[PDB]
Design a protein around this ligand. Sequence first.
Ligand code: CLA
Ligand code: CLA
Ligand code: CLA
Ligand code: CLA
Ligand SMILES: CC1=C(/C=C/C(C)=C/C=C/C(C)=C\C=C/C=C(C)/C=C/C=C(C)/C=C/C2=C(C)CCCC2(C)C)C(C)(C)CCC1
Ligand SMILES: CC1=C(/C=C/C(C)=C/C=CC(/C)=C/C=C/C=C(C)/C=C/C=C(C)/C=C/C2=C(C)CCCC2(C)C)C(C)(C)CCC1
Ligand SMILES: CC1=C(C/C=C(\C)CCC[C@H](C)CCC[C@H](C)CCCC(C)C)C(=O)c2ccccc2C1=O
Ligand code: SF4
Ligand code: SF4
Lengths: 42, 193, 97, 733, 80, 66, 154
Amino acid sequence: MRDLKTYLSVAPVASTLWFAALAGLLIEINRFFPDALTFPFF
Amino acid sequence: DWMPGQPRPSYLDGSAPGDFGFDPLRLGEVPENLERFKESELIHCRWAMLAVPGILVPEALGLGNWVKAQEWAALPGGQATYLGNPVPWGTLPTILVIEFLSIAFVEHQRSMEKDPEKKKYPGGAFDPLGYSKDPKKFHEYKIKEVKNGRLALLAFVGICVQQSAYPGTGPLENLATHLADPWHNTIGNVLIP
Amino acid sequence: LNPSLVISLSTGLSLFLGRFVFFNFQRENVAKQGLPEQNGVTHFEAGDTRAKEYVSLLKSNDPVGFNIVDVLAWGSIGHIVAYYILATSSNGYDPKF
Amino acid sequence: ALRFPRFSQGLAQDPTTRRIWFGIATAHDFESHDDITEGRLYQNIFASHFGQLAIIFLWTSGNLFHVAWQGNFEAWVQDPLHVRPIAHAIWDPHFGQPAVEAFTRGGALGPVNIAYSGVYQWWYTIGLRTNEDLYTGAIFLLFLSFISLLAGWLHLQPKWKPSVSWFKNAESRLNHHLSGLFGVSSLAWAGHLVHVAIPGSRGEYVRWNNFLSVLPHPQGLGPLFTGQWNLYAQNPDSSNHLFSTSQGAGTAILTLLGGFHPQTQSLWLTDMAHHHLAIAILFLIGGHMYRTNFGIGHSIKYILEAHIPPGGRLGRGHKGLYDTINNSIHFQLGLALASLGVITSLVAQHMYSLPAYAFIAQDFTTQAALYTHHQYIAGFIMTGAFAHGAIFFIRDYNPEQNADNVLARMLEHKEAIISHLSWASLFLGFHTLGLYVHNDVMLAFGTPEKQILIEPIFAQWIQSAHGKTSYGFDVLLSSTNSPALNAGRSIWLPGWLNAINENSNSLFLTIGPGDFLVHHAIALGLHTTTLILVKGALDARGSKLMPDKKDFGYSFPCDGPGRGGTCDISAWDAFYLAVFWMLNTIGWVTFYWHWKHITLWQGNVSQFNESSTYLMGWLRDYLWLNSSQLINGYNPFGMNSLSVWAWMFLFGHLVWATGFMFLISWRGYWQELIETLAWAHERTPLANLIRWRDKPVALSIVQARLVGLVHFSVGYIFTYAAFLIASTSGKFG
Amino acid sequence: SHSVKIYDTCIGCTQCVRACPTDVLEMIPWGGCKAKQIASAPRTEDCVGCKRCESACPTDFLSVRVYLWHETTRSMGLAY
Amino acid sequence: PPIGPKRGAKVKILRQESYWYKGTGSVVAVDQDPNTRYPVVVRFNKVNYANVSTNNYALDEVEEVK
Amino acid sequence: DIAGLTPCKDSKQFAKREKQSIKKLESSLKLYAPDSAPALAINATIEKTKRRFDNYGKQGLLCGADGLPHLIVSGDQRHWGEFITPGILFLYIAGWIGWVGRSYLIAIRDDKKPTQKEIIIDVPLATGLVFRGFSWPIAAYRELLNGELVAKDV
Ligand code: CLA
Ligand code: CLA
Ligand code: CLA
Ligand code: CLA
Ligand SMILES: CC1=C(/C=C/C(C)=C/C=C/C(C)=C\C=C/C=C(C)/C=C/C=C(C)/C=C/C2=C(C)CCCC2(C)C)C(C)(C)CCC1
Ligand SMILES: CC1=C(/C=C/C(C)=C/C=CC(/C)=C/C=C/C=C(C)/C=C/C=C(C)/C=C/C2=C(C)CCCC2(C)C)C(C)(C)CCC1
Ligand SMILES: CC1=C(C/C=C(\C)CCC[C@H](C)CCC[C@H](C)CCCC(C)C)C(=O)c2ccccc2C1=O
Ligand code: SF4
Ligand code: SF4
């Protein structure tokens, strides 16, 4: 468990998880507001 | 002090006439630069003080504003007019050469000095009434001179910026239109169209 | 308008300015700037024979040292300004206010 | 000594073929030659300059002779717009009959080459009309080159060779060059334009045998000395004027109109003569600045040392710079190359937008060739200027004599400069490539409307400020009551505004988002090339990886594999890597220019506007699209006049590709291969009777890099020249 | 013949001498460090310029410096 | 009277051809012996390009800093 | 309008491109069954295209002769939604990222083996640090004014 946590935070694994989360977030934002070329709210 | 609560520059003690410790950019850090700055300031102040009445007095009379009075030179037949009469030698190349020569000679004669106190306060032929007798009364006169000179410089800046704001108008016209309707006619309309 | 009048007047005036007004200033400046030098020695002192200053024609009998080279210089300035005046006065160009 | 090279005793003892190679590649590096002194170096440089002048004169004389001999000048001047100028005849015994048939053009009696240097238009404008004039010019130039060689030889001989003190007299040289080389030369050119070219463009044929009997103006020299100069501009040429005829001709010799000649679409000759006269006056006045033997004027070093700001933000300012510039010849060469490259690029930028030669604006291939020419040469000159700056740092820099001046302070904060320049390059590259890839992906998905098209609004505003009225910005010159507009309404603004708003020339082309993106690509290229060169120069004297680099010379292979490995650590290697980026940047510049102009010449500027925003548009609508006639120059069904380019197009592809060899494969492999080859040759019958005299060896590391770069560059230039000339000439539009 | 120099920062570790693949360097008596040793280069005519000695020097900067110079058949490492 | 900075001190390097030039290191030992021109021994927390963390310096090359 | 462009809402080539895009999309739809999964997907795409074009017309983008939207970045207040407020948003996010990373580097710089916490990210500390990027605009400003943003002695 402790060693699993340690290995699960090593550079490659942490980076892949971070970028998967970022990709999912951006994908969902684009899905809800697609084809957005300007900021119209204000 | 020019700003109650702000520490004063080390090289500006307060002994010089008009010293109020104003030097945010610290241009007078080097003393030999500060001396030249003082002379230049007095020259600018004197020019502005001798000019601003010249900008206002003719305007108060039945002549044009300071910018209309120097527009006749832009015409092929430019000829000057002083106090409502055409001067003979008013054509541009003349006025130009006579002014250039006189000013160059006088400025060179002025610059041929290395006192450097008479550099700023020459005296002699330039003090006929002889106001420089008591050394301390002379100092308060120096303070008054520099104060009025700074005021005149600020006034000239205001005149020029007003002219830019409302082309074809003079300071007295701006004052009159402000007095006609103070609140609505102010700088705000210029700042926020 | 009269080219001879304008040229002569302007040249004489420029010579007067050089001889009586800016004379001492120019002499002081040329004294303090000095001869051009390379590696601390003047051009002649480094072995350049042609760099030698022509001490012969520079001296004059004028009380203050007004010589040939400066008559050439100030007269050239006077003629340049005179012909500028003539050409620009006869050009007929007019800007519009 | 005792063998080639005689200038290097260390090389002459090399028992390998290297001695030959390095013998050729260091012949002009006088400073590294044995028994070299000061006066020897300066005299050799002086004589080599004379040799270069002789070569230049001989080359231009050859151009003249060939155009007069196998040219088309007499026929071309009859109808400049409907006949192709001829460069020189072709005599190739390898040609086949169809090749001879295809290459005979321009009304010649045999195969000939169509000139694209633009010499025909240039010589026509200046006044040359017949073949006799060209022959006389060629003979005069042959005499001139002979005289140049004679001068060089004369100054080689003792008792005529100048001393070093003479070479370092900067004040007098500057005075003479400004007032003499520049001023008097331009005054003479204005004289020729007034006396020959302007009359030539009006019917009269003024030549040596009658130029003293013809007045250039009806009231010759009367107005000039009287001061009433306006009489020389009182009757300009009417707008309905055929060039070399008196129909609609005027009498003005000097003017300032600003437009173009309506028929030739080039600048007025009178305007050009006036320009040259004016700048001649300016140069003559300004060349009296420095002090010589007459006791008046300026001393450059005093001006330099007096320019030190109080407050010490610049340290000691320019103190000591005169001696480091005058004593360092590489500093002088670097400054000269920098200025020359800037003005060569300026020439390139101005020649296409403000043509000065008659009927050259209608010769599209000539315009394209000249622009690409001058831009590539300017890039090479700039790269060389930076190279010689680095060389100066290595060789002629004295740290103690330059203590705390601008140069030393540049050296001591090199890292901030390099890092900030790197940041600028990274920003430009990241965002330019990002926008290009975004647009390309957007068009891949069939949604062009979702692109990021940024209007080059600042450049459009500047164009409006010049007087263009296609963007509706209403600025100076494009407004109505602006002082700038009103001041020049009676001099040049009429013609200038007529020319700029006219949309068939190249005077301030209309610009859009594609122009924005490509200009930012240009900026990226400039910044990255400057990064490489500045980093190579400022780190030439040494860095953290090799602090004692200054003692290893300008160019050396490496410092071995220790300390992590030190490949390409020299300043020479920094220049080496910068040449690739220079080629890439100038390639982008010329791609942009050529595509814009080829789409404008077709009246199809839209097509460029649509397809420039994304890279696939560049790849398909420009490279692939404009490359059909060229590749078809010869095919299984015969050949046409473009075959020679189609061959060159492939030739440039081969050279470039073999350049990749020396750049990828390195020395050790080739050395071992050559060793086994030597064994094999020594072990075979009848051929071991033949013995080499210099031991074969693989090319040096630096030499291999240089050869690879030379192949890369030659292939680059040849393939692009073939493509450009074939595509523009294939359509002639 | 390449030029090999030994600078006074040498600590007499001997690692450069072990590395030379042509026996160019040596150890000589000396008195300015604890080992009383310093490197010498009496046979630079046999130096091939490999710079393998510099890769072994632990001082910063190096105490042994190889400056490539005129090339001979010995320096070029040619067996033919 | 020992010479140079004390053991465990904090010195910055002034040798311009050193990797840690203008850097900082900890003094390890200064030899009391004369006739040695690089007595000071300094240790750094960063290796150089040769992967070495210790070097000797002359007395004037090191400068005790706070 | 600005730079000779015209609003997309009243532009004609923009409408022509919109119609052509919808026509191209519809061309494929007629091939399949009226209410199959491919047909539903194509209908959804057509509706998405219509919504996109209507939104572009609504926001008031500028269209050139090409009929495509163009972005004005000179600073005109009529177009701040095109580059300036997205630019401010990017600057905020990027400064967030950089400040958080710098804070992590400074925090782990005191250990005997800082590199160990660099190849193996100390997530516990990172989770506490990531939230400083909400207020990094103030932290960095006071860091600069206090004079310890930039390493002196260097
Ligand atoms: C297509 C060829 C190519 C490309 C793309 C580059 C690109 C670059 N070169 Mg280079 N160069 C090239 C050929 C090329 N070069 C050649 C043939 C030579 C001759 C040897 C050189 C010699 C050279 C030198 C000497 C230098 C450069 C430098 C640079 C960088 C300049 C900084 C910049 O512009 O920001 C960025 C530019 C980009 C194009 C961004 C690239 C990254 C993008 C965003 C992709 C991101 C990855 C993406 C997420 C996909 C990941 C996939 C996954 C599997 C990992 C840049 C990255 C300079 C430098 O280092 O800058 C300081 C430098 O000094 N080049
Ligand atoms: C050219 C005019 C001029 C000059 C040469 C000086 C020179 C000097 N002033 Mg002074 N001053 C001036 C005008 C000038 N002043 C005006 C108009 C005012 C009223 C606002 C003052 C009010 C003032 C005070 C209260 C004090 C000084 C003081 C000083 C002395 C010390 C400061 C210094 O070293 O800076 C040197 C200054 C300059 C080199 C001029 C700077 C010019 C820069 C390059 C441009 C300025 C930009 C400006 C804002 C443009 C406005 C344009 C318009 C559109 C608004 C020095 C000799 C101090 C002193 O000890 O007196 C002896 C002092 O306390 N001045
Ligand atoms: C007035 C211009 C000028 C002058 C006077 C010099 C003078 C000098 N340069 Mg320099 N240089 C210049 C411009 C100039 N350069 C420019 C524009 C560049 C940018 C490319 C360079 C880049 C440069 C570098 C990198 C170096 C020099 C070096 C030198 C010095 C030795 C050159 C030598 O003898 O090598 C011998 C000459 C050669 C090897 C040239 C033969 C090989 C050429 C490149 C092949 C030509 C192309 C090919 C044959 C054409 C295709 C063939 C066919 C298919 C058509 C010398 C003092 C060298 C030096 O040692 O500095 C001290 C040095 O390393 N220069
Ligand atoms: C267009 C690029 C190019 C070309 C032309 C070559 C050509 C060659 N490579 Mg090569 N290579 C390249 C790219 C290229 N490479 C690159 C980029 C790399 C990096 C990976 C390599 C790495 C590489 C290695 C490692 C090796 C080679 C080898 C060879 C040679 C093989 C021997 C041979 O083919 O016999 C004959 C040569 C040819 C067919 C080439 C064209 C010859 C023409 C047709 C003859 C024209 C003659 C003409 C009449 C001359 C008159 C002109 C006159 C004015 C002088 C050959 C000369 C091998 C080698 O050296 O062989 C032992 C070798 O080991 N290459
Ligand atoms: C003796 C004397 C005197 C007098 C004298 C005199 C009077 C003389 C002179 C003189 C002079 C008076 C001189 C002059 C001058 C000089 C010169 C040397 C010059 C010049 C100029 C020039 C050279 C110019 C040119 C030009 C040209 C060609 C181009 C266009 C135009 C111009 C103008 C620019 C007296 C009695 C007083 C006193 C005593 C002494
Ligand atoms: C390395 C080095 C070197 C070199 C370097 C270089 C070469 C650099 C550069 C550079 C460059 C090459 C630059 C350029 C520039 C330019 C500029 C800076 C400009 C400008 C501006 C202006 C002044 C403008 C004006 C105007 C007008 C007049 C009007 C119209 C508009 C305009 C705006 C155009 C040397 C050898 C020396 C030394 C060592 C170091
Ligand atoms: C091919 C190759 C060789 C071997 C190259 C050799 C042996 C050159 C052989 C060429 C012969 C001499 C014919 C070349 C023909 C030339 C066109 C003649 C030019 C001579 C003058 C006109 C200048 C290297 O030694 C090498 C070294 C380091 C990196 C890359 C390489 C590399 O790529
Ligand atoms: S370069 Fe190689 S052969 Fe020469 S001394 Fe050093 S280790 Fe020995
Ligand atoms: S490797 Fe360096 S420190 Fe060791 S003995 Fe050789 S020169 Fe001296």
